[PDB]
Amino acid sequence: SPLRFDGRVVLVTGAGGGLGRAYALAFAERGALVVVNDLGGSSAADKVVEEIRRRGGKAVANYDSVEAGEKLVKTALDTFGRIDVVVNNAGILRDRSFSRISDEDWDIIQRVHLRGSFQVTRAAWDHMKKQNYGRIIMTASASGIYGNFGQANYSAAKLGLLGLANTLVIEGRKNNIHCNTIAPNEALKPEYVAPLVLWLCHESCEENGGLFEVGAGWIGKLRWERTLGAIVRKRNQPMTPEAVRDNWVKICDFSNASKPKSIQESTGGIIEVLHKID
Amino acid sequence: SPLRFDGRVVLVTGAGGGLGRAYALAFAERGALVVVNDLGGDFKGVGKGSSAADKVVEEIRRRGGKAVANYDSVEAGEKLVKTALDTFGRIDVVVNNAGILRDRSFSRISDEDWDIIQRVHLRGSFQVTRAAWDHMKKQNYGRIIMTASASGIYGNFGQANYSAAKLGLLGLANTLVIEGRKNNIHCNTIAPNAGSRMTETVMPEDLVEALKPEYVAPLVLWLCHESCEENGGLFEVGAGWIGKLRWERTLGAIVRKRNQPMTPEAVRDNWVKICDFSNASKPKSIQESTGGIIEVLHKID
Numbered sequence: 001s002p003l004r005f006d007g008r009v010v011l012v013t014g015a016g017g018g019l020g021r022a023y024a025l026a027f028a029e030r031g032a033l034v035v036v037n038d039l040g041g042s043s044a045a046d047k048v049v050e051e052i053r054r055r056g057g058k059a060v061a062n063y064d065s066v067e068a069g070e071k072l073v074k075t076a077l078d079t080f081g082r083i084d085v086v087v088n089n090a091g092i093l094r095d096r097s098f099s100r101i102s103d104e105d106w107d108i109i110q111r112v113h114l115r116g117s118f119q120v121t122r123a124a125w126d127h128m129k130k131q132n133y134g135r136i137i138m139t140a141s142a143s144g145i146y147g148n149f150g151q152a153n154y155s156a157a158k159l160g161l162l163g164l165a166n167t168l169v170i171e172g173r174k175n176n177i178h179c180n181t182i183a184p185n186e187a188l189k190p191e192y193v194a195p196l197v198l199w200l201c202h203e204s205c206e207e208n209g210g211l212f213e214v215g216a217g218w219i220g221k222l223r224w225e226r227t228l229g230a231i232v233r234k235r236n237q238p239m240t241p242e243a244v245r246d247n248w249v250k251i252c253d254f255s256n257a258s259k260p261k262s263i264q265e266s267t268g269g270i271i272e273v274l275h276k277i278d
Numbered sequence: 279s280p281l282r283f284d285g286r287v288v289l290v291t292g293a294g295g296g297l298g299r300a301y302a303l304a305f306a307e308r309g310a311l312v313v314v315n316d317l318g319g320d321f322k323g324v325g326k327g328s329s330a331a332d333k334v335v336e337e338i339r340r341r342g343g344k345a346v347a348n349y350d351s352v353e354a355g356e357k358l359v360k361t362a363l364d365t366f367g368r369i370d371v372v373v374n375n376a377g378i379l380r381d382r383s384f385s386r387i388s389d390e391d392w393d394i395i396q397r398v399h400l401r402g403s404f405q406v407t408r409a410a411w412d413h414m415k416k417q418n419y420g421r422i423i424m425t426a427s428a429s430g431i432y433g434n435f436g437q438a439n440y441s442a443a444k445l446g447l448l449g450l451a452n453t454l455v456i457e458g459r460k461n462n463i464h465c466n467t468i469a470p471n472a473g474s475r476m477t478e479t480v481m482p483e484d485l486v487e488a489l490k491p492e493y494v495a496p497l498v499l500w501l502c503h504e505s506c507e508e509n510g511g512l513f514e515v516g517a518g519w520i521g522k523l524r525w526e527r528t529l530g531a532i533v534r535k536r537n538q539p540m541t542p543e544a545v546r547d548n549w550v551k552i553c554d555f556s557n558a559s560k561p562k563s564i565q566e567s568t569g570g571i572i573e574v575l576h577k578i579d
């Protein structure tokens with residue numbers, strides 16, 4: 001069956017252009033009731049709404065800053081009586097070599113990207129819980145996953161978003177609230193990522209807590225792997241940095257690495273290590 | 279040969295107790311000139327006192343080492359480095375360890391609950407590190423430690439603010455690793471497990487007393503030693519065990535075909551492939567990621 005969002009209210013932030021607008025247009029065309037938001041920095045959002053209405057879809061605009069998150073969800077509620085999907089897309093760039101990053105260059109990036117997504121997602125959270133339905137998208141970036149010269153501020157905010165999502169996955173799974181994160185990328189058409197966002201935000205999708213790099217027509221998934229590592233301490237004998245150095249190769253050897261999935265498992269391993277030594 | 283830090287100046291933020299304290303004592307015992315910083319407040323973000331830092335500096339002195347205290351909040355990062363510059367004249371290593379908790383279920387995290395965690399953990403580390411950056415570049419040497427956590431890596435109920443800040447620190451380090459390379463400035467991240475005032479509520483009491491901060495100090499000392507070459511690593515450490523983490527990426531799927539609109543249904547149809555990790559690759563750079571997307575265009579056309 002073709003992917004429809006009929007009756008689903010979808011809030012997209014920073015949807016005045018690029019990726020956002022492309023999601024706004026992709027969603028509405030499949031029956032979604034879209035709340036198009038964009039700080040317009042008011043004509044930015046209005047233009048996309050128009051495109052949607054003209055296309056035979058339904059939508060309304062919101063002109064507030066994601067910093068004013070509560071307001072973006074209010075527009076979804078006051079206009080459609082609910083909120084099902086939140087795509088956190090709003091973002092800006094303030095690239096500088098690390099030493100030249102001013103306090104403001106840092107703060108503004110955290111405010112729009114991270115604090116913005118926290119405010120908006122927090123405003124919709126209880127509504128999603130009470131109704132037992134929610135699909136959330138966080139927009140990370142390769143610069144966050146890998147790092148990238150001149151983007152210390154941006155890379156920290158993007159991975160911070162992943163951290164936020166990891167927890168939301170835990171707190172929301174019981175109420176059918178899914179949260180996934182993407183790292184998207186002239187020829188790199190925004191319509192090449194939109195389909196992944198639509199799938200990840202569909203009611204038939206069961207993916208929760210995934211991290212995805214998207215671009216050019218390709219999609220890949222990322223996860224952590226951890227080395228079996230080494231116990232470099234013996235009971236009654238103080239642990240030394242020399243033991244760490246002398247076991248460095250083993251500690252860093254990824255052969256048969258585990259694929260850790262929760263904090264419990266990690267904590268459980270540490271407690272078992274303590275028991276083996278004792 | 280035993281690892282020493284003679285002639286090295288080490289700044290440890292939040293060295294008044296727990297992990298920070300164990301690090302400062304270990305460094306000082308090995309010859310390092312240590313600036314022990316601590317705001318002297320509680321683990322919830324309320325308070326200020328000079329005794330936290332003063333006691334550690336006293337313990338170090340009694341053990342025959344040399345240290346000086348700094349009482350500023352990491353939020354005033356630049357001042358910690360100044361204490362290092364004014365007292366010893368250089369700054370070789372920065373261990374960003376200062377931290378607090380403000381646990382609440384997501385819906386109940388207030389704006390201040392969020393902002394204060396970010397200010398101290400992330401913004402504070404950025405401030406302290408940024409203040410030492412040019413000094414390390416001039417010295418053509420530097421060792422930096424960011425303290426993340428398992429809750430940031432895996433997520434953890436009631437800590438959305440904390441977990442975002444902690445992985446946020448990792449994204450900061452990812453970049454510092456690239457920018458500090460030519461100047462021998464290494465930056466590594468750790469996710470420690472040690473019993474402290476900050477962990478009682480998530481650890482049976484006896485487990486608290488048994489998971490010593492002294493079991494993680496050894497790793498921190500090695501990663502900050504001149505002879506260590508590790509740069510940009512992420513390590514989980516506790517009880518005497520150490521392990522390393524890294525990303526693995528699926529080979530994935532090209533769901534788009536030449537002149538044929540890409541659809542959501544196509545993505546759904548290639549889901550098993552997209553999520554299969556057999557022969558996954560181990561990506562390490564944004565350039566290789568960008569090179570890859572560009573190769574996808576070529577393969578398709």
Ligand SMILES: NC(=O)C1=CN([C@@H]2O[C@H](COP(=O)(O)OP(=O)(O)OC[C@H]3O[C@@H](n4cnc5c(N)ncnc54)[C@H](O)[C@@H]3O)[C@@H](O)[C@H]2O)C=CC1
Nearest residue numbers: 014016017018019038039040065066089090091141184185
């Ligand atoms: N296009 C690409 O290659 C990549 C994009 N990304 C991320 O994708 C997202 C959007 O990317 P693009 O469309 O390419 O960029 P963009 O800059 O065109 O889109 C951001 C949108 O955010 C809106 N905005 C800015 N501040 C706002 C605020 N305070 N409140 C509400 N809206 C606000 C802007 O008006 C703009 O339309 C961002 O989060 C960006 O970091 C990440 C990696 C690569």
Ligand SMILES: NC(=O)C1=CN([C@@H]2O[C@H](COP(=O)(O)OP(=O)(O)OC[C@H]3O[C@@H](n4cnc5c(N)ncnc54)[C@H](O)[C@@H]3O)[C@@H](O)[C@H]2O)C=CC1
Nearest residue numbers: 292294295296297317351352375376377427471472474476
């Ligand atoms: N112990 C554990 O199992 C884990 C610890 N961590 C992290 O390790 C670090 C240290 O944790 P613990 O030693 O266990 O806790 P702790 O509470 O004993 O030590 C933290 C120290 O930071 C100081 N501090 C707080 N806010 C400060 C500020 N603004 N400026 C300067 N100093 C400040 C406190 O006074 C305290 O001495 C933190 O960043 C924590 O989030 C992360 C995961 C697990």
